[PDB]
Amino acid sequence: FPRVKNWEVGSITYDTLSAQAQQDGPCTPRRCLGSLVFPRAPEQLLSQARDFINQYYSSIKRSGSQAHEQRLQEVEAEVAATGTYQLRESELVFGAKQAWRNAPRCVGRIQWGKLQVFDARDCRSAQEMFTYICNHIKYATNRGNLRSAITVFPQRCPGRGDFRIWNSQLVRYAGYRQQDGSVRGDPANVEITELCIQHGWTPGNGRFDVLPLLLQAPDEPPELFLLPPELVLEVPLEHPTLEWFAALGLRWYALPAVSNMLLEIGGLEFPAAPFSGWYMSTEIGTRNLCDPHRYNILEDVAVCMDLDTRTTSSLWKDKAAVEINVAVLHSYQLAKVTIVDHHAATASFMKHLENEQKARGGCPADWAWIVPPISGSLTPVFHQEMVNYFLSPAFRYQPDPW
Amino acid sequence: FPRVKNWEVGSITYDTLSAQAQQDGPCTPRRCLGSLVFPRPEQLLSQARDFINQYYSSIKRSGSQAHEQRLQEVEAEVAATGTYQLRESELVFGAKQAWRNAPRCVGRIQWGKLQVFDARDCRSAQEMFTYICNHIKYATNRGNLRSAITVFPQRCPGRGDFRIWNSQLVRYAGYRQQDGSVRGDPANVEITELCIQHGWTPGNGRFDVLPLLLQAPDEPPELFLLPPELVLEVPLEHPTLEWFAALGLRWYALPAVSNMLLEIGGLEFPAAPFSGWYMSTEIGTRNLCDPHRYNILEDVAVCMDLDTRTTSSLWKDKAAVEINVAVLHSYQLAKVTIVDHHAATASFMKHLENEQKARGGCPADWAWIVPPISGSLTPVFHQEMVNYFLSPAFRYQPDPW
Ligand code: HEM
Ligand code: HEM
Ligand SMILES: Cc1cc(N)nc(CCCN2CCN(C)CC2)c1
Ligand SMILES: Cc1cc(N)nc(CCCN2CCN(C)CC2)c1
Ligand SMILES: C[C@H](O)[C@H](O)[C@H]1CNc2nc(N)[nH]c(=O)c2N1
Ligand SMILES: C[C@H](O)[C@H](O)[C@H]1CNc2nc(N)[nH]c(=O)c2N1
Ligand SMILES: [Cl-]
Ligand SMILES: [Cl-]
Ligand SMILES: [Gd]
Ligand SMILES: [Gd]
Ligand SMILES: [Zn+2]
Fold this sequence. Notes:
Two copies of one chain form a homodimer. The first copy, chain A, is α+β, with helices and mostly antiparallel strands. Chain A has three domains: 15-121 and 148-158 and 262-276 and 346-370, no CATH class; 122-147 and 162-233 and 397-401, no CATH class; 234-256 and 279-344, no CATH class. Helix content of chain A is 33%, strand content 13%. The first copy, chain A, contains ten helices and 18 strands. Chain A has helices at 42-59, 66-82, 89-101, 126-141, 190-198, 281-290, 298-304, 316-335, 342-360, 367-370; strands at residues 3-5, 12-14, 116-119, 149-152, 164-165, 175-177, 183-185, 213-216, 223-225, 234-236, 251-253, 257-258, 262-265, 268-270, 275-276, 279-280, 339-340, 394-396. In chain A, helix 1 (42-59) packs antiparallel against helix 2 (66-82), helix 6 (281-290) crosses helix 8 and helix 7 crosses helix 8 (316-335). Chain A is globular, with a radius of gyration of 23 Å. Chains A and B meet through strand 1, helix 6 and helix 8 of A and strand 1, helix 6, helix 8 and helix 9 of B. The complex binds protoporphyrin IX containing FE (2 copies), 4-methyl-6-[3-(4-methylpiperazin-1-yl)propyl]pyridin-2-amine (2 copies), 5,6,7,8-tetrahydrobiopterin (H4B) (2 copies), chloride ion (2 copies), gadolinium atom (2 copies) and zinc ion (ZN). It is classed as oxidoreductase. The entry lists the keywords nitric oxide synthase inhibitor, heme enzyme, oxidoreductase. The assembly is dimeric. The entry is titled "Structure of human endothelial nitric oxide synthase heme domain in complex with 4-methyl-6-(3-(4-methylpiperazin-1-yl)propyl)pyridin-2-amine".
């Protein structure tokens, strides 16, 4: 079992939980590929099902009881009879929480037990799908006191196509290829913008235009649905002492809601199961606004700050990024929208690792995604060695449906 | 062949060089251990043969006379003596390759410019000290630093090793108290009490340069006191925060690692110090601000009158940036070579491109190439990397006590 050191304190633990990792990752003893963003039959369905059922019955202090073996035989009979099986409602709640608990690139997992699970497995159409989604956004936003939630749409099954949300998040800003070479709005979203237009959306031409939703019912082309503006809570960005910062016209939205990942529970697959929490400020301040391939505002802010941008050693990039993050935090706090800074988030992740060490003997964590993109070694996770592996239930990436 | 993408630009390459990985890393399909710092008879000919072909292809002299010739003498030298000796040029070439192959080094754009001091006829701790002193004075060069490595004799059976007990050639002391805690550098508490054990009269300050403990084969170590005028140091001030000078902070000019083992063509040099110049985050961010190092972050923030009562004021981030500003400013004012993390990472991206065309890839350790402040503001953050182990190499090694 791997030995893990914390270099700030001197602590040493052993991740015995990793030895239970079932699915494989991209590394070998030849070469480590940890830094890559996207690394990647009835009896095999059965073995995954059996394991998750074991997991659930372990969690309810009923391992090896009547009910436990009853459910095991029940599932196999249903796989033999139908090729698949159905989760009970409590099993679904537990599986959705474990999937979050198990996600190695999430720093906010101290919250994994507090998750509101909406069961939309009866969903019938794209129109019902949209109504479920609007209710999700409304509950999670909660006027700025954000609540963690996931809505689970019907599972993959033989004979019918998948439900899919084509959008990568429920809230995204348009990216319009410009007259010259530039992009207006969010360059990360040029493709989905083009698909929405191709599917009859009338584009805008601002930098923060909220995209419509493309929703796919089984064996249907996607359908366009506009989000009511009063559903999408946004935060204008201002800076507590740089009064010109407001004149940049920057905004960001309250709700981070990932909508293109696949939820896996006991071999069953839910290709449509959007989940949401609340932001950590560096995702907005550092990545979304300062990435050269995103809004790329860093130089314009530094010039406005009167910094000397002709030489790297003045650290003008670092200084302007810090104030952009201050602005994000101040603005969300002013608007009373939940937000966590990278210092508080990494410190609560440290409690999560200690909680998880006692509970399960380890915790899967992807160091490069856990450590914030600014001020890395100022946070305690920097000095924590970590073991990255795949547990199930899980949220996995999947191909775009176009 | 691993697909490698740059997410800033969208470019793709393939790492065909990863195929040659001699030693195996710590990762398995089951789990990744990339974030761990240190992981937990005639087959000398295989590694020697392979290194010789490496030398001769590099000089465009594969499959010719001198190449054929040199393959035989290494064959006969081992047959007679059980080991072999490197030609001076090969020792040079193998030292530059080990640097070139170091996955955690972001300064490798410089790998071709390395001064190799051959101390292989060393015979006592006294000779060591004079070698190490020539190196230090040459590498320091009055603040215009020059990369350098001194190579002491190769290990051989039945006889002890040459070992430098200090982790670097310049280290500040770390002193315990009537209450346990540390004055000076906490990273050096162990060697500090080793030096005191072997007779060094300890100082009282937070920046006392330690004495050297040099160890010739089969004789216990011997204290050596560096000439104070040979240890170039930079007092730390800030361009606009006039009180910063008063904090009394300093750092030394020469980063010179003296505890790693150099392996070339199957030969092992447990004592082979190498030196370059600092990247400024090493001093300003890790050495001065790590909680287990000098841990000065709150003291600077108090002096800047920052709100240390809430983490969301980002007072830690602001104080850290100014500490790095003070490091860069002080080193440049003193005309001592230093490079900031933006310049350094941008040169590394050029290194990657050079290495792609020349060797088909480059072993890089993402967690160590990305700087410890402002990570995603540098281009290496957005570059996928592949980590693997090529020879010649620098490796870590046990402590000689
Ligand atoms: C409640 C507060 C939460 C915080 C502060 C938080 C924070 C984060 C951050 C900073 C990342 C890295 C994302 C990036 O850099 O792009 C991440 C990734 C992730 N989070 Fe969390 N998260 C929260 C809630 C949730 C919830 C409720 C779920 C699922 C039920 C979840 C599942 C995931 C997954 C699957 C990823 C990796 C997906 C990806 O971005 O590639 N998170 N989280
Ligand atoms: C010339 C300017 C150089 C710069 C700016 C530089 C910079 C760095 C930095 C920032 C690290 C990260 C280590 C840490 O964060 O603790 C590193 C590691 C390393 N460097 Fe370089 N370096 C230089 C020259 C050299 C030379 C000349 C050699 C050997 C001949 C070398 C060999 C290594 C090795 C083996 C490591 C990883 C092992 C370790 O120290 O932990 N470097 N370097
Ligand atoms: C639920 C949740 C909360 C949070 N605070 N953050 C996230 C991640 C945002 C998605 N990321 C965007 C960039 N990248 C393409 C990977 C996907 C999710
Ligand atoms: C040659 C060189 C140049 C440079 N600029 N930096 C270094 C790294 C200094 C040692 N570090 C900190 C201690 N750590 C255990 C080993 C790595 C080396
Ligand atoms: C190439 C590199 O792995 C990539 O840019 C990663 C690095 N770490 C990250 N970490 C987080 N949290 N989010 C990211 O998007 C990334 N991107
Ligand atoms: C735990 C973690 O792997 C460890 O602190 C590493 C991370 N990255 C690093 N990167 C550099 N350059 N130097 C270091 O000492 C470390 N430490
Ligand atoms: Cl986002
Ligand atoms: Cl150092
Ligand atoms: Gd102002
Ligand atoms: Gd004052
Ligand atoms: Zn790995």
